[model samples]
Target: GEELFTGVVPILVELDGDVNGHKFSVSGEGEGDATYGKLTLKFICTTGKLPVPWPTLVTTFVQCFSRYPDHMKRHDFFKSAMPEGYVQERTIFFKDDGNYKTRAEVKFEGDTLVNRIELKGIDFKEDGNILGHKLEYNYNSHNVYIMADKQKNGIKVNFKIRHNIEDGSVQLADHYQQNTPIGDGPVLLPDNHYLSTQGALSKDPNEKRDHMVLLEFVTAAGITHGMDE
Candidate 1:
């Protein structure tokens, strides 16, 4: 018997803010089924300039999915089926015709899972506007960090992770955004505060762990229908 599962998973980082006269909003959705073992995720920017590089934004957004318990539970099955390796692909599209694509692959090397990510197409480099660009990252384990330190024009992005000493789980501490082209000093804004105000995060642990708000799953016999169907 073939088991089918379908769902719409919301991206974790969703917010609207202004940086250096550029207004932008971040939002995305994932749609696919477990029967085929494929998930297509999209990151969207509908307004203003991207506050950070497309690769950083995409990877950070993808990392948020790991916070969802339901997705992780299903992901276990997905991973078990792929004994050798698997690849998850993602794409980002901007309203101004800029776009980017990324592919993350995990291969089991002995007892270790080697993770590799490849990205391509428009990134915010010139004028903080989304242009075509590509990025590739390789690492081990589920935790991957893409850090950069340089004097640049656009916005400077920084993220923090909290490691739980008791449970060995990593939590998102904060995402900080700062206006670039540092002159005197830059004011760092806590992006998580904005996400909380937007109803994405909550102080209540139960509410935060409820993945239903971030993802919806449906199971059926035949091919699962699209979100609209």
Candidate 2:
């Protein structure tokens, strides 16, 4: 969260955090301000043959995260790339084993400086020893903000994440930008800037001014948006 970029009080835009059962995390380092968005949070599941093979699950999960690109690509690059079913269940946070519908919501009001965030997970299916889960959340509708002094009439907030090709660019710009919600705007394609989970505002204050962009990424489910399997 860019404390300096948001032109408001020193409030971190905790876009995701502990509310019901989930918490949030972000990555991207540089001079400007940036935060995580377009998250894919999921859990790796296996039909534990008699003794629960947590090691297999954890190691495979870790390997997937380390080996796979931030966006994750493989056999089924598009359709199967995401988790199919897993949420609000016993796999990760639940006391018992089951499936859950998990996702996060973030809101920022014009008057309020800090961005309001909540993680919501629901839905479940339990099997004797094998538990299934599921998760779901919002997109685009997630709000945006700006520094009263730095914001414009049209610019609003958007999201980006860590894996984005321009990860460093977004992070560096975030530190440099002097206001929040960054600026104001209609999101643009990345000639660079737009990456992972970040928000963008449509204004730049300096001479020969170019628009400002912020970068962000989600660290849930080893992927950005947990699809469920």
| Candidate topping lDDT | 1
lDDT of 1 at 28: 48
Backbone clashes in candidate 2 total 66
Q: Which run of 10 residues does model 2 get worst, by summed lDDT?
A: 56-65
Query: Model 1 scores what on Cα lDDT?
Result: 0.32
**Candidate 2 segments exceeding 4 Å error:** 1-9, 12-113, 125-185, 191-229
Candidate 2 lDDT, 26-125, residue by residue in tens = 2211221112222222221122121221211111110011112334332111111112111111113333332222232112223222322223333322
Lowest lDDT block of 10, candidate 1: 190-199
After superposition, candidate 1 runs with Cα above 4 Å error:
1-77, 123-125, 129-229
Measured on C-alpha atoms, candidate 2 has an lDDT of 0.21
For each candidate, give its TM-score against the true structure: 0.29, 0.20
Candidate 2 root-mean-square deviation in Å = 20.0
Q: In model 1, what is the error at residue 56, expressed in angstroms?
A: 2.9
